[PDB]
Amino acid sequence: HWGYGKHNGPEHWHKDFPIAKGERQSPVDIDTHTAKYDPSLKPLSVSYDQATSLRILNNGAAFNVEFDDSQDKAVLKGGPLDGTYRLIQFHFHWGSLDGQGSEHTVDKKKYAAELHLVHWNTKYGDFGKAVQQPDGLAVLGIFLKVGSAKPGLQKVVDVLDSIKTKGKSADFTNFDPRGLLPESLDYWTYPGSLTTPPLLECVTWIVLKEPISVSSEQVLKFRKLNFNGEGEPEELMVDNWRPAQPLKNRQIKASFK
């Protein structure tokens, strides 16, 4: 099955998922000089005050913090979006070393990690129907650099020991994702895809310009997770990022000058 090893990594995914070579694949390099300011773009509206986290799961590709999405509790609206998108989960991608780990890049710069807050368009009723639509998902991407600790991340870091291996989960209630946001909500946006199989071309990407800072110790703990299941040879969950894909016939728009 697909993964991030030498034998099953991103360069192999097209054999099972031919859309991997499609016209609107993610992630991409964000060339800052070519992204054009679009004065028609609105401020992003991030409404997470009533977010209800439930569980954290190691799915063998990353860890997901899952939310109750049975009602409009934590929603993303505005920005480039038409309509209301409900938060279902967040997860990260990260590297074996601080100099790599992000999926998007900025003028070819790789950050240490990248947070994806995944939201689905409520007009399609459920996540499964949403991923079949070109405007079905909105993913808020936030870069992580290593420096000062991010206090609002520590609760996530501290539970990781309990979900070391694929298939493990732990209760994870009352987590406030507002603690993972940077100060500014300035962003780039473009149409793209899921960055893991099935690689569906159903995502409006919104990537924040301002990275958050996390400490070396925080990200070191990410790197102690495992891709493997319990009792299997240990494969550290590191370098779980898909590299940048061709931009093709797309324009990246900036919300800021």
Q: Calculate the alpha carbon distances from 4 to 68, 190, 240, 241 in Å.
A: 29, 25, 6, 8
Q: Is 5 exposed, middle or buried (0-12, 13-18, 19+ CB in 10 A)?
A: exposed
109: DSSP letter: B
Question: Binding-site residue total for Zn ion (CB under 5 A)?
Answer: 1
- Cβ 11 to Zn ion shortest distance, Å: 18
Of 1 and 33, CB closest to Zn ion: 1
- Regarding 86 and contact with Zn ion (CB under 5 A), the answer is no
CB of 10 to Zn ion, least distance (A): 13
Q: Which residue in 86, 89, 106, 93 sits closest to 54, CA to CA?
A: 89
* Distance of alpha carbon 124 from alpha carbon 131, whole angstroms: 9
Residues of this chain, 229-248, that bind Zn ion according to CB under 5 A = none
Which residues have C-beta within 8 Å of that of residue 40, sequence separation ≥ 6?
none
Distances, alpha carbon 85 to alpha carbons 65, 99, 182, in Å: 17, 32, 20
- Identify which range of 25-33, 68-76, 114-122, 124-132 contacts Zn ion by CB under 5 A: 114-122
Residue number closest to Zn ion, CB atom:
116
Measured from the CB atom, the residue of 41 and 113 that comes closer to Zn ion is 113
Three-state DSSP at 85 gives strand
Alpha-carbon gap, residue 185 to 182, rounded angstroms: 7
Nearer to Zn ion, 38 or 239 (CB): 239
CB of 39 to Zn ion, least distance (A): 30
Cβ 144 to Zn ion shortest distance, Å: 13
Q: Which stretch binds Zn ion (CB under 5 A): 20-28, 45-53, 111-119, 122-130?
A: 111-119
**Out of 116, 150, 209, 221, the residue judged to bind Zn ion by CB under 5 A:** 116
How many helices and strands (H and E) does the chain possess?
3, 15
Q: How far is the CB of 229 from Zn ion (least distance, A)?
A: 21
> From the CB of 113, what's the least distance to Zn ion, in Å?
11
From the list 22-30, 110-118, 164-172, 220-228, the region that binds Zn ion by CB under 5 A is 110-118
Residue 40 burial class via C-beta count within 10 angstroms: exposed 0-12, middle 13-18, buried 19 and up: exposed
Which residues would be at the binding site for Zn ion (CB under 5 A)?
116
